[PDB]
């Protein structure tokens, strides 16, 4: 399985930041 990363960038680009994936779960970080 992969992440929802498209809706993980999604969720965090309200917030400014750039959305990645670890195996499947995903996080988001500053520029």
Request: some cysteine.
């Given at each position: 399985?992969?992440?929802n990363?498209?809706r993980?960038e999604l969720?965090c680009?309200?917030l ?5 994936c ?8 500053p520029?």
């Amino acid at each position: 399985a992969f992440c929802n990363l498209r809706r993980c960038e999604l969720s965090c680009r309200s917030l400014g930041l750039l959305g990645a994936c670890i195996g499947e779960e995903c996080k988001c970080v500053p520029y």
